[model samples]
Target: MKSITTDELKNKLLESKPVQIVDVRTDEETAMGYIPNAKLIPMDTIPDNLNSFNKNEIYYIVCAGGVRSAKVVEYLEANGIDAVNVEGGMHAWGDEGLEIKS
Candidate 1:
């Protein structure tokens, strides 16, 4: 799996790429805030929501940090889905000055 820096991801988002930004964090954790437009599908629900996305489409997976997203990406890849983990997840995203939703 390839990794993208928070700055790079932010630029891509600002450019409006047809990216699927997924937050693998839990609902309670998400109450703090999340990347705008992020699809909040906890890691536990990935298998259940797997059919919602095209296996060939690329997705940007994220969590509170990067660990959970890494696991999620591994699962998706094993299931024939294309997914990339954001190098530092939401923390790095916030470090890059990206906006978040509460």
Candidate 2:
């Protein structure tokens, strides 16, 4: 699966680019804080929500750390969507001092 650094993703968001983010974490992890405008779709619901994805569009999948989102991106890419996993995920985002929302 393709990957992008948290720092890189943050820069795109800060510029208000057309990229989209689909967070794959659960309630608690997300409630703590999340990337601005991220759409919270828990990892467990991915399969069911797969049909809702826009195949032609690119998506940046996210999680607490990179593992879950990596898996999610694998699934999406296998299903023919352009999916990118955020390396280090929110953990790196927080550590790098990027913006967040609760």
Candidate 3:
């Protein structure tokens, strides 16, 4: 599946691009912290919410780690939706000390 690193994502954010992010973590996990403007949708619910996504927009999928986001990227690509996995996931985002919201 396609992928983008935390640094790349940060650059996009800095440019104020209309980037769409899907966070595939549980609500409880997300409660701890999450990227700003990310939509909270657990991994399993992604299939059900597929129609809600905009086909014209690029989507960045993220989880606590990269594994689950990669799986979601595969699923999206299989369904003809364009998406990229966030390399190293939220852990990397935290490690980078990027802005986050609780």
Q: Pick the candidate with the highest lDDT.
A: 3
lDDT agreement of model 1 with the native: 0.81
- Output the worst ten-in-a-row residue range by lDDT, candidate 2: 93-102
lDDT of each: 0.81, 0.83, 0.85
lDDT per residue (tens digit) for residues 1-102 in model 3:
689998898889777567998899987888777887888899988889988687688889999989999999998888878999999998888834434453
| Cand. 3 TM to true fold | 0.88
List, residue by residue over 1-102, the lDDT tens digit for candidate 1.
778877787778567546788888998887777777778898888889977778668889998789999988889889888889899887877733334553
Weakest 10 consecutive residues, lDDT, candidate 1?
93-102
In model 1, residue pairs whose N, Cα or C atoms come closer than 3 Å (at least 3 residues apart or on different chains), thus clashing, are none
Per-residue lDDT value at 88 in model 2: 88
- Give the better candidate number (1 or 3) by lDDT: 3
Candidate 1 stretches with Cα past 4 Å from truth are 95-102
Kindly give the stretch of ten consecutive residues in candidate 3 with the minimal lDDT sum: 93-102
Report residue 7 deviation for candidate 1 (angstroms).
0.8
Q: Which structure among the candidates has the greatest TM-score?
A: 3
- Please provide TM-scores, in order, for all candidate models, with all chains considered together: 0.86, 0.85, 0.88
